[PDB]
């Protein structure tokens, strides 16, 4: 199931929905989590915190089913709103979702 991108809420951006599964069985080998490293508590120039992908394992789920790259801002993790949450916040969000066999992350390009 590929990912899709629909018009943002401002009509000037594209917000797609990315679904990742921590099955750990990508074509590469086993991986570890889903396929990309994310960061939290990244205070932007707007005045709010968010999440950013530090890196993506070429071949992992996040790459094949997600299709993103380090630098993308994920305003949604596991169907939860991250905007406003700091590094410690995201930590709880993701970690809590790290146990789930499926995840839903959204970004903004």
């Amino acid at each position: 199931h590929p990912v899709t991108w629909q018009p943002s809420k401002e009509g000037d951006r594209l917000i797609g929905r990315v679904i990742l599964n921590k099955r750990t069985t990508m074509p590469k080998e086993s991986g570890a989590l889903l396929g990309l490293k994310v960061v939290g508590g990244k205070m932007t120039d707007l005045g709010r915190l968010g999440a950013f992908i530090t890196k993506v394992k070429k071949g992992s789920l996040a790459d094949v089913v997600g299709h993103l790259r380090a630098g993308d801002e994920v305003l949604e993790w596991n169907g939860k709103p991250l905007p406003g949450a700091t590094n410690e916040e995201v930590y709880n969000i993701i970690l809590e979702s790290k146990s789930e066999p499926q995840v839903e992350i959204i970004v903004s390009r």
Binding site: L20, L33, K37, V38, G40, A62, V90
Partner: peptide, 6 residues
């Protein structure tokens, strides 16, 4: 600069 492993 990291945060969580995914």
């Amino acid at each position: 600069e990291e945060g969580i492993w995914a």
